[PDB]
């Protein structure tokens, strides 16, 4: 019926797609996720929002999903939409592996998902997915890679980026702190801890995943509470020394 | 006859706290050998393997589709699959083609991901599963393998003895089959390690 | 199999043997081939057991729903028509000869044959199954108009007994059912209750 | 394969041999042919093993949904109806011959179900390649309203007849006793056959097999 | 106020205004009456003639929906013809499936449910017609049913649909139709149609008469021309005096 | 808020700001449009449904005007509200019961039939393109295990078993009367249950019924088949009520 | 207003405004007249020219040997309906080897055009038809409307200013049955001329005729083939 | 008719899916429910107040078994809950048919939450107006999950839903303890319900289910009567 139809996939008089803009507004308030690319690996660091004291932990992590042997992602926005999209990502990766018997290159996976999102923005009369994703991966064509995609189906590769709450301030910090081509996993983790400290920290409030290569194999690992506590303490004493020096 | 088109033989055997899975290496078309290193045993976990005999195209297709399904299962569940669950998954896959069946008869051999208990089983081409406590076999030389295993298998074998038993069974069984052989590969699966060996075998 | 139904003033008498074979093996020797389709409507089944079971179940469902909708007792002719529609529509897939016999207030007692192929005919009496071939003459010689219910029961018992004696695919016990306004009276003749005819000697 | 069932005074006894063959070679010496349907309903299966397994699993799951929704114990007639309508839908191409037995609110019930979807409700039934021998035992010895031990012995004798006279049947005898107040899944109930003792030793000592290549992959443990 | 635009929307009072509007369409139509007597059913219709250009018998509002079932309509004629096609299909399908004439009550229920299906959705609109079904059989007697746009079906001894239904009902209630024959009832039907007809507003009209009963051997048919001429003479004589 | 509205929440089944479904409430209001009332009472070994019968026109064929329907030989129902909606729902219930018997081999229990109908209704409450039916169904029957059964389902998809219940214009007063009656005691005989139902209807309407003004349907453990009483039996009950 | 945009919306008065608007579509079209005698059915159509250099739009169409139609309203809808009618007549001749009776064709048109008047998003057909036919019951003039109603007429006129033609036809219909073909066509032409304004006049360019009868298959006369029928026509008042 | 093809849940300029928030308002107006995960089991409790004594309180249950080892309860709209229960039982059976193993609690919760999400984006439907508490036992471990109308799910040690659930959560925070056994968990759950309960609680006023190694089961009125007598 025409009367009740929301008209989700139509242009506005200024050439805008209002549902997509509103979905991006939704993502703007979600938990902060940041990705940093280094020479010897790539990391994701996400702010945990499920911080109630009676919550139980049963899973690999709250906001970081393994997509395949060589790729993981973090999601900011509508959680259930994110579950739908992560399942689709895993299916796309496995289909590629079935057809070619090699792992899907990261950008091909990102493009395949962004096609679905874009389709939801152009026809069908459905609301778009209210999810932005950060992807980290490794393949043989381009090595360590970090991508970002948004509800419009746009995507881009980054050396460092941030989505979710306070993403603009985090991006400014990364612009002024990232050394192109001169980043290690260790300094990348230090920078991630600093940036998350500014745009907000304590160990239970952040989950960190690293992706590295070991013996021609990809290792995706979520840092345990011990490692994150040590990183936070290292940042705290670094800041104490910096303050004292001045 | 369709499953004799390419030949081949796989066998699995249970030891004390270990399993063995073995396969012949020949890939041929009827009487002609094409290669002598065709893979018939595929890893499905750290301590879980599936051997596939029968039509080579169906061997490859079933291994690939099973890997598809297993990868999705292990991502979604966040855990390694148990051998019995893999057996059920394979049975479902094969039965889906009940009237268009894949021409392969898998064997599965592994250890429980949490308890490291030996597991072996076999399936017919439409997916009827059979779990056994001593040994299973599949392929063109099934009768020969049955004879050898019935005669040589003993309970509670340590890994070295299991290796010798399965190796002798496979070698002597395939020596009496024209379209199986050209080498034998054996995987011994234990709690702490996987030992892969290729045997000195007749190449005629 | 041998099935039979006979009309009498005020009702019908149905009868069947109880043998179900697979090849020459008797899988069931006390089969019940008289199936109630409704309170006062029965069918006798011959042919493939699976086909007649499925068709009779489908007709039972359809007729019960129809009777509920109309709030009236179903007509025997309606049950015969449903059977006919199913047997004709799937004549290439079904192997089912049916006799629909019953009582309704509008037309009294009625017998309809729905043989293989799905034609439908009303008859004063009907026989069917492999064994019926052996009793055609007998029935044609013995049937007469105005038989009472007791006479019809005896006639059916005799006919089925003869068929069973000759037909390897028939035998067991004789199941009879009399249907009238008052209801359905079922009985089983077995052993010495089955009519006997001496085998000629010398 | 030999499977059988009887109705006794207070319930059902089902029985099966435990051999599964491929052609004329024994594949499984310890095949379990009595399948769970519901806590009060069991099913022995002959014919195509995959067909039997899948059909009984499907009907068991559907009956579980039905019982969850109704909150009542399932009826044997429901299982029979579901099975027979499915089998008829497949026009005999699902090669499942079944002996379905249970105890529900209306007492004990035993059905034989044939691949084409025909069913028979009977006080005793046999199926499989050894069905005729077991049926001979039943016809010779069955009596109505036997006590539990008599019924167990009778079904066991029937399965034994199948085991010893049909090449397709062998190995152990499994029983399943169903009553309103219990279920006894006796696997194995009897072991009439056993492998003979191995007179000689054919133990392959270490080093007997020649090896071309070897590769040891250490596995990381928790 | 927005609540009356779709049949899939209840008003805050629990009414479905689109159905009521369809009923209004019915109410703005020339009247038809059915009368059940001991021997059968008689239908009369006041077919308004909107111009002399039309052939006599144009836009008939009495239909044969089955050998034994006649149908009289009021409201949107095209909707009524659609419902008559539906009724004919129902009767033919019933004969095909069950092998005998559809009972009138069952046919009325089936057509009423078809009508009801159009009262639930925004995709379609309710039918704009009311109609009566009449039948006579040896086993069932004489049956007269009426169905309205909401899909409500009821059996009647005397029924009037259209714009003069209340006055026609007042006139019908004066007859003891339960102990009358079709031959007298046709005259009474003609008289009632002539009484309720508005001579000023409605201009000219044709009387349409049909019946089904013992005298027709259970077949629904137009009343023979001589019978109708006698009935119309009686109705005019009753009016003039 | 209270009675707040956003968007189209008064026209289609979408949540209002309070989490309400206004169209469902409006269907409940539509139930009362018929102007009638029915009551159902569960006895020890019987269940009874009484309902108003109204035939304002003497031209109506009173036999065809009823709200009691056989769903199965052992299940009967009384429908309240919009008549055509009620007839469609009765047709659906008959279909569900016949299909149940065809698929499972035993008669559908009353509770399961009520659940099935309620699930269909719930679907009407979540899909926007159709309206809910404006009717309420009360089913009675004898379950071999639970005994007599009275169940009710409504346009919200909500259903429940009852000791006694009512539907229609005088639902609230009927429920108050029946609540007092069941509080005082509940172990009623067949005559007692019928008289309780009739008294509930008479008191809420304040009428003393002639036989032709009400309809009665009963199931009993002795005769589980659903039976609709005749004016003779109803008048016998009415006289046995007046005398006391 | 809120009631006058969809065919599935009843107005509070019990009307369906979209159908009335389609009626207007018909009332805009150029006049056409149909009439009949005991033996013949005649359609006479006044054709419009959009420009003085354009040909006049054809208003009479063939359907079958025994059936022709005159259209008034949207011409694309007219073509849709004409194609449907042609297919129905072809189906009748294919299956029963007999011409489709005119009344049955009209009933089929009624069902086809009623369907869209009840479904959301559909519109009524925006064309009115005069159908001239001959069958075993004699000649027939039918009028079909966007409302899906149809009428069996002694004579009819539809289109712009057709009320004048209807007045003439009402006046003179007593004479149509016992008219020969020439007198019948002349009556049709006078009726059609009544629709014309004073400045306009009937010529061989803006008039088309269609005739069907017992021994005459449906024939359309255009251009000079109309001159024989116009020759005997007197001068208008 | 065929259903509307456009979504009835769309983004607002602030980035909110307001229909989901309204379904959550419906949930918050539901009857209180409580879940507590003990060391050796899980307890689901829910207020089950009937409008009148005429209601046969033992005819419809709010605590439902999904599988031998999985049960659930809800806050919000009952009919929606029945829909979700039917879907959950179907999903569990499908999992069992493929894997021949009882579905893990987390997997069942994920599948049901997927269905609930589908009802926030598909055409012509509203979201479910319910929140579910799903309890299960597998791998020798108890599991307590909550699934919301939006299709988001969370793992809890203890939680409360429905009317007055914020006070219930504070109360559970104060009382809860990871080491307590199942019987202590049942006592704590009933106490949590008592906080927001109107009138006296009886074994017929509340419904309780428990999941442990043996499986999930609804407690009987006699067992609940014993626990209530102990609570006093």
UniProtKB/Swiss-Prot annotation, chain A:
Sorted alphabetically, which keywords does the UniProt record give?
Answer: Acetylation, Cytoplasm, Host-virus interaction, Nucleus, Phosphoprotein, Proteasome
Q: By what name is this protein known?
A: Proteasome subunit alpha type-4
Question: Cross-referenced Pfam families, in alphabetical order?
Answer: Proteasome, Proteasome_A_N
Q: Which InterPro entries match?
A: Ntn_hydrolases_N, Proteasome_alpha, Proteasome_alpha-type, Proteasome_asu_N, Proteasome_bsu_CS, Proteasome_sua/b
Q: Which GO terms describe its cellular component?
A: cytoplasm; cytosol; extracellular exosome; intracellular membrane-bounded organelle; nucleoplasm; nucleus; P-body; proteasome complex
Q: How does it assemble?
A: The 26S proteasome consists of a 20S proteasome core and two 19S regulatory subunits. The 20S proteasome core is a barrel-shaped complex made of 28 subunits that are arranged in four stacked rings. The two outer rings are each formed by seven alpha subunits, and the two inner rings are formed by seven beta subunits. The proteolytic activity is exerted by three beta-subunits PSMB5, PSMB6 and PSMB7.
The places in or outside the cell where this protein is found are: Cytoplasm; Nucleus
Explain what induces or represses this protein's expression.
Down-regulated by antioxidants BO-653 and probucol.
Native species: Homo sapiens (Human)
In terms of Gene3D superfamilies, this protein maps to: Glutamine Phosphoribosylpyrophosphate, subunit 1, domain 1
- The PTM N6-acetyllysine maps to 126, 175
Q: In its UniProt record, which GO terms are filed under biological process?
A: proteasome-mediated ubiquitin-dependent protein catabolic process
Spell out which residues are annotated as carrying Phosphoserine.
Answer: 12, 74, 172
Tell me the PANTHER family matching this sequence.
PROTEASOME SUBUNIT ALPHA/BETA
What protein family is recorded?
A: Belongs to the peptidase T1A family.
The domain of life for this entry's organism is Eukaryota
Swiss-Prot record, chain C:
Q: Where in the cell is it found?
A: Cytoplasm; Nucleus
What triggers or suppresses the expression of this protein?
Down-regulated by IFNG/IFN-gamma (at protein level). Up-regulated in anaplastic thyroid cancer cell lines.
**What GO cellular-component annotations does this UniProt entry give?**
cytoplasm; cytosol; extracellular exosome; mitochondrion; nucleoplasm; nucleus; proteasome complex; proteasome core complex
What's its EC?
Answer: 3.4.25.1
Annotated active site residues, numbered on this chain, are: 1
Please write the reaction equations for the catalytic activity of this protein: Cleavage of peptide bonds with very broad specificity
- Write out the entry's keywords from A to Z: Acetylation, Cytoplasm, Host-virus interaction, Hydrolase, Nucleus, Phosphoprotein, Protease, Proteasome, Threonine protease, Zymogen
Phosphothreonine sites (modified residues): 35
In Gene Ontology terms, what is one molecular function of this protein? Answer: cadherin binding
Any idea what job this protein has? Component of the 20S core proteasome complex involved in the proteolytic degradation of most intracellular proteins. This complex plays numerous essential roles within the cell by associating with different regulatory particles. Associated with two 19S regulatory particles, forms the 26S proteasome and thus participates in the ATP-dependent degradation of ubiquitinated proteins.
- Report the family membership: Belongs to the peptidase T1B family.
Question: Under which name does UniProt file this protein?
Answer: Proteasome subunit beta type-6
Recite the lineage of the species. Eukaryota, Metazoa, Chordata, Craniata, Vertebrata
Curated annotation (Swiss-Prot), chain F:
Keywords, ordered alphabetically? Acetylation, Cytoplasm, Glycoprotein, Nucleus, Phosphoprotein, Proteasome
From its record, what is one biological process in GO terms? proteolysis involved in protein catabolic process
In this UniProt entry, the residues modified to N6-acetyllysine are 101, 103
Q: Which Pfam families match?
A: Proteasome, Proteasome_A_N
Tell where it localizes: Cytoplasm; Nucleus
Q: Which InterPro entries match?
A: Ntn_hydrolases_N, Proteasome_alpha, Proteasome_alpha-type, Proteasome_asu_N, Proteasome_sua/b, Proteasome_subunit_alpha6
- Where is it mainly found? cytoplasm
Residues carrying covalently attached carbohydrate according to the record: 4
Query: Which Gene Ontology cellular component annotation is one that this UniProt entry carries?
Result: proteasome core complex
- Recorded superkingdom: Eukaryota
Answer yes or no on keyword Nucleus: yes
Q: Name one GO molecular function term.
A: RNA binding
**Residue numbers carrying Phosphotyrosine:** 158
Record-listed Phosphoserine modification sites: 16, 62-63
* Similarity annotation: Belongs to the peptidase T1A family.
Assembly and oligomerization = The 26S proteasome consists of a 20S proteasome core and two 19S regulatory subunits. The 20S proteasome core is a barrel-shaped complex made of 28 subunits that are arranged in four stacked rings. The two outer rings are each formed by seven alpha subunits, and the two inner rings are formed by seven beta subunits. The proteolytic activity is exerted by three beta-subunits PSMB5, PSMB6 and PSMB7. Interacts with ALKBH4.
**Function text:** Component of the 20S core proteasome complex involved in the proteolytic degradation of most intracellular proteins. This complex plays numerous essential roles within the cell by associating with different regulatory particles. Associated with two 19S regulatory particles, forms the 26S proteasome and thus participates in the ATP-dependent degradation of ubiquitinated proteins.
Q: What protein name does the entry list?
A: Proteasome subunit alpha type-6
UniProtKB/Swiss-Prot annotation, chain G:
Covalent cross-link (Glycyl lysine isopeptide (Lys-Gly) (interchain with G-Cter in ubiquitin)), residues: 112, 205
Identify the keywords attached in UniProt to this record, alphabetized: Acetylation, Cytoplasm, Glycoprotein, Immunity, Isopeptide bond, Nucleus, Phosphoprotein, Proteasome, Ubl conjugation
An individual GO BP term: proteasome-mediated ubiquitin-dependent protein catabolic process
The Phosphoserine modification is found at 107, 174
The molecular function terms in GO held by this entry are: lipopolysaccharide binding
Taxonomic superkingdom: Eukaryota
Triggers of expression: Induced in breast cancer tissue (at protein level). Up-regulated in liver tumor tissues.
InterPro entries registered for this protein in UniProt: Ntn_hydrolases_N, Proteasome_alpha, Proteasome_alpha-type, Proteasome_alpha1, Proteasome_asu_N, Proteasome_sua/b
Indicate where this protein resides in the cell. Cytoplasm; Nucleus
Question: Can you tell me which family this protein belongs to?
Answer: Belongs to the peptidase T1A family.
Kindly provide the name given to this protein in its UniProt entry.
Proteasome subunit alpha type-1
Which gene underlies this protein?
A: PSMA1
């Amino acid at each position: 019926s025409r009367r009740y139809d929301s008209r989700t996939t139509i242009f506005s008089p200024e050439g805008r797609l209002y549902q997509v803009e509103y979905a991006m507004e939704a993502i703007g308030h979600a938990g902060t996720c940041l990705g940093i690319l280094a020479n010897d690996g790539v990391l994701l660091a996400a702010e945990r929002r499920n911080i109630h004291k009676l919550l139980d932990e049963v899973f690999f992590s709250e906001k970081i999903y393994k997509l395949n042997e060589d790729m993981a992602c973090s999601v900011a926005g509508i959680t259930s939409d994110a579950n739908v999209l992560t399942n689709e990502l895993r299916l796309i990766a496995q289909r590629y592996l079935l057809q070619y018997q090699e792992p899907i290159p990261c950008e091909q996976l990102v493009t395949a998902l962004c096609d679905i999102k874009q389709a939801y923005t152009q026809f069908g009369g459905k609301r778009p997915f209210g999810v932005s994703l950060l992807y980290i991966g490794w393949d043989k064509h381009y090595g360590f890679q970090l991508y970002q995609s948004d509800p419009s189906g746009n995507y881009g590769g980054w050396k460092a980026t941030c989505i979710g709450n306070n993403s603009a301030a985090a991006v400014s910090m990364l612009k002024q702190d990232y050394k192109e081509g001169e980043m290690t996993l260790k300094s990348a983790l230090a920078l991630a801890i600093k940036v998350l400290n500014k745009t907000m920290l304590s160990a239970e409030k952040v989950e960190i995943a690293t992706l590295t290569r070991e013996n021609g194999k990809t290792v995706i690992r979520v840092l345990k509470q011990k490692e994150v506590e040590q990183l936070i303490k290292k940042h705290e004493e670094e800041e104490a020394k910096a303050e004292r020096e001045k | 006859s369709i499953m004799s088109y390419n030949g081949g033989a796989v066998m699995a055997m249970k030891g004390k706290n270990c399993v063995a899975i073995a396969a012949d290496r020949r890939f041929g078309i009827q009487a002609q050998m094409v290669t002598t290193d065709f893979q018939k045993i595929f890893p499905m976990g750290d301590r879980l393997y599936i051997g596939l005999a029968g039509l080579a195209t169906d061997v490859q297709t079933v291994a690939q589709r099973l890997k598809f399904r297993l990868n999705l299962y292990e991502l979604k569940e966040g855990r390694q699959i148990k051998p019995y669950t893999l057996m059920s998954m394979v049975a479902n896959l094969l039965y889906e083609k009940r009237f268009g069946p894949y021409y392969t008869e898998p064997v599965i051999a592994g250890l429980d991901p949490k308890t490291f208990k030996p597991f072996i089983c076999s399936l017919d081409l439409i997916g009827c599963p059979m779990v056994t406590d001593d040994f299973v076999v599949s392929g063109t030389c099934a009768e020969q393998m049955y004879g050898m295993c019935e005669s040589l298998w003993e309970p509670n074998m340590d890994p070295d003895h299991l290796f010798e038993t399965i190796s002798q069974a496979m070698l002597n069984a395939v020596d009496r089959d024209a379209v199986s052989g050209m080498g034998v590969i054996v995987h011994i699966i234990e709690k702490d390690k996987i030992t892969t060996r290729t045997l000195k075998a007749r190449m005629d | 199999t041998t099935i039979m139904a006979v009309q009498f003033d005020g009702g019908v008498v149905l009868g069947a043997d109880s043998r179900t074979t697979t090849g020459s093996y008797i899988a069931n020797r006390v089969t019940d081939k008289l199936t109630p389709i409704h309170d006062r409507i029965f069918c006798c089944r011959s042919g493939s057991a699976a086909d007649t079971q499925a068709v009779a179940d489908a007709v039972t469902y359809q007729l019960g729903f129809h009777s509920i909708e109309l709030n009236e007792p179903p007509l025997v002719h309606t049950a015969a028509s449903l059977f006919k529609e199913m047997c004709y529509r799937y004549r290439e897939d079904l192997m089912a000869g049916i006799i629909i016999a019953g009582w309704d207030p509008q037309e009294g007692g009625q017998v309809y044959s729905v043989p293989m192929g799905g034609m439908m005919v009303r008859q004063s009496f009907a026989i069917g199954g492999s064994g019926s071939s052996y009793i055609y003459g007998y029935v044609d010689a013995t049937y007469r108009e105005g038989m009472t219910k007791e006479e019809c029961l005896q006639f059916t018992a005799n006919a089925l007994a003869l068929a069973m004696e000759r037909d390897g695919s028939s035998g067991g016990v004789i199941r009879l059912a009399a249907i009238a306004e008052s209801g359905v009276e079922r009985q089983v003749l077995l052993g010495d209750q089955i009519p006997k005819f001496a085998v000629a000697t010398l | 394969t030999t499977i059988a069932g009887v109705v006794y005074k207070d319930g059902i006894v089902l029985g099966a041999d435990t051999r599964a063959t491929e052609g004329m070679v024994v594949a499984d010496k310890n095949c379990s042919k009595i399948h769970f349907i519901s806590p009060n309903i069991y099913c022995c299966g002959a014919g195509t093993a995959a067909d039997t397994d899948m059909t009984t699993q499907l009907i068991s799951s559907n009956l579980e949904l039905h019982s969850l929704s109704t909150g009542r114990l399932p009826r044997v007639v429901t299982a029979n109806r579901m099975l027979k309508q499915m089998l008829f839908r497949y026009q005999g191409y699902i090669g499942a011959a079944l002996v379905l037995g249970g105890v529900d609110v209306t007492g004990p019930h035993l059905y034989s179900i044939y691949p084409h979807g025909s069913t028979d409700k009977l006080p005793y039934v046999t199926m499989g390649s050894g069905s005729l021998a077991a049926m001979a035992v039943f016809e010779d010895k069955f009596r109505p309203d036997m006590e539990e031990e008599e019924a167990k012995n009778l079904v066991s004798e029937a399965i034994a007849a199948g085991i010893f006279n049909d090449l397709g049947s062998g190995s152990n005898i499994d029983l399943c006793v169903i009553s309103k107040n219990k279920l006894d899944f006796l696997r194995p109930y009897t072991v009439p056959n056993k492998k003979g003792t191995r007179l000689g030793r054919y133990r392959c000592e270490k080093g007997t097999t020649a090896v071309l290549t070897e590769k040891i992959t250490p596995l990381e443990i928790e | 106020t927005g609540y009356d635009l779709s049949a899939s929307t209840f008003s805050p009072d629990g009414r479905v205004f689109q159905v009521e509007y369809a009923m209004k369409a019915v109410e703005n139509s020339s009247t038809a009456i059915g009368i059940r007597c001991k021997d059968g059913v008689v239908f009369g219709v006041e077919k308004l003639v909107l111009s002399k250009l039309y052939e006599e018998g144009s836009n008939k509002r009495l239909f044969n929906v089955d050998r034994h079932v006649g149908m009289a309509v009021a409201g949107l004629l095209a909707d009524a013809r659609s419902l008559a096609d539906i009724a004919r299909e129902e009767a033919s399908n019933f004969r095909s499936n069950f092998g005998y004439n559809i009972p009138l009550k069952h046919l009325a229920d089936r057509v009423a449910m078809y009508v009801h299906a159009y009262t639930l959705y925004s995709a379609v609109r309710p039918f704009g017609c009311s109609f009566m079904l009449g039948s006579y059989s040896v086993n069932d007697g004489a049956q007269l049913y009426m169905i309205d746009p909401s899909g409500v079906s009821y059996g009647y001894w005397g029924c009037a649909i259209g714009k003069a239904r209340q006055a026609a009902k007042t006139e019908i209630e004066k007859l003891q139709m339960k102990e009358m024959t079709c031959r007298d009832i046709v005259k009474e039907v003609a008289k009632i149609i002539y009484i309720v007809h508005d001579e000023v507003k409605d201009k000219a009209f044709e009387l349409e008469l049909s019946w089904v009963g013992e005298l027709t051997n259970g077949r629904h048919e137009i009343v023979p021309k001589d019978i109708r001429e006698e009935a119309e003479k009686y109705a005019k004589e009753s009016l003039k005096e | 808020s209270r009675g707040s509205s956003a968007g189209f929440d008064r026209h289609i089944t979408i949540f209002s700001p309070e989490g309400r479904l206004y169209q469902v409430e409006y269907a409940f209001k539509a139930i009362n449009q018929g102007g009638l009332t029915s009551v159902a009472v569960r006895g020890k070994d019987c269940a009874v449904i009484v309902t108003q019968k109204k035939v304002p026109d003497k031209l109506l064929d009173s036999s065809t005007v009823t709200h009691l329907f056989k769903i199965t030989e052992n299940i009967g129902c009384v429908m309240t509200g919009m008549t055509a909606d009620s007839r469609s729902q009765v047709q659906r219930a008959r279909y569900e019961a016949a299909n149940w018997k065809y698929k499972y081999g035993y008669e559908i229990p009353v509770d399961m039939l009520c659940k099935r109908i309620a699930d269909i209704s719930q679907v009407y409450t979540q899909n926007a393109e159709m309206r809910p039916l404006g009717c309420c169904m009360i089913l009675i029957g004898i379950d071999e295990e639970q005994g007599p059964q009275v169940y009710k389902c409504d346009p919200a998809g909500y259903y429940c078993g009852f000791k006694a219940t009512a539907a229609g214009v005088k639902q609230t007063e009927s429920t108050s009367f029946l609540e007092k009656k069941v509080k005082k005691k509940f172990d009623w005989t067949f005559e007692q249950t019928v008289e309780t139902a009739i008294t509930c209807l008479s008191t809420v309407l304040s009428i003393d019924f002639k036989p032709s003004e009400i309809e009665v349907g009963v199931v009993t453990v002795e005769n589980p088949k659903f039976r609709i009483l005749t004016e003779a039996e109803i008048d016998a009950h009415l006289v046995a009520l007046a005398e006391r | 207003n809120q009631y006058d945009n969809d065919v599935t919306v009843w107005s509070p008065q019990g009307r369906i405004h979209q159908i009335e608007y389609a009626m207007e579509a018909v009332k805009q079209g150029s006049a056409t007249v149909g009439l009949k005698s005991k033996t013949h059915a005649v359609l006479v159509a006044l054709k419009r020219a959009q420009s003085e250099l354009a040909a006049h739009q054809k208003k009479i169409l063939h359907v079958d040997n025994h059936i022709g139609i005159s259209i008034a309203g949207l011409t694309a809808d007219a073509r849709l309906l004409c194609n449907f009618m042609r297919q129905e007549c072809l189906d009748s001749r294919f299956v029963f080897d007999r011409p489709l009776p005119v009344s049955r064709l009209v009933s089929l048109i009624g069902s086809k055009t009623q369907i869209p008047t009840q479904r959301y998003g559909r519109r009524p057909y925006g064309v009115g038809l005069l159908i001239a036919g001959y069958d075993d019951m004699g000649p027939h003039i039918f009028q079909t409307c966007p409302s899906a109603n149809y009428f069996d007429c002694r004579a009819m006129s539809i289109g712009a200013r057709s009320q004048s033609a209807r007045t003439y036809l009402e006046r003179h219909m007593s004479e149509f049955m016992e008219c020969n073909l020439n007198e019948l066509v002349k009556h049709g032409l006078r009726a059609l001329r009544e629709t014309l304004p004073a400045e306009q006049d009937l010529t061989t360019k803006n008039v088309s005729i269609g005739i069907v009868g017992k021994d005459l298959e449906f024939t359309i006369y255009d251009d000079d083939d109309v001159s024989p029928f116009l020759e005997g026509l007197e001068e208008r008042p | 008719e065929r259903g509307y093809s456009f979504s009835l849940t769309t983004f607002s300029p602030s980035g909110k899916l307001v229909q989901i928030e309204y379904a959550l308002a419906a949930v918050a107006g539901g009857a209180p429910s409580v879940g507590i995960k003990a060391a050796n089991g899980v307890v689901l409790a829910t207020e089950k107040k009937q409008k009148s004594i005429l209601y046969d309180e033992r005819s419809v249950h709010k605590v439902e078994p999904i599988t031998k080892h999985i049960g659930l309860v809800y806050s919000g709209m009952g009919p929606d809950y029945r829909v979700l229960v039917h879907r959950a039982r179907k999903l569990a059976q499908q999992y069992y048919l493929v894997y021949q193993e009882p579905i893990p609690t987390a997997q069942l919760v994920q599948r049901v939450a997927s269905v609930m999400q589908e009802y926030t984006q598909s055409g012509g439907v509203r979201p479910f107006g319910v929140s579910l508490l799903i309890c299960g036992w597998n791998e020798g471990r108890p599991y307590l999950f909550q699934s919301d109308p939006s299709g988001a799910y969370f793992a809890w040690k203890a939680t409360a839903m429905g009317k007055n659930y914020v006070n219930g959560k504070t109360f559970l925070e104060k009382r809860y303890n990871e080491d307590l056994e199942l019987e202590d968990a049942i006592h704590t759950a009933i106490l949590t319900l008592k906080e927001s309960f109107e009138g006296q609680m009886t074994e017929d006023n509340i419904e309780v289910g428990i999941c442990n190694e043996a499986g999930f089961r609804r407690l009987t009125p006699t067992e609940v009567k014993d626990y209530l007598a102990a609570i006093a």
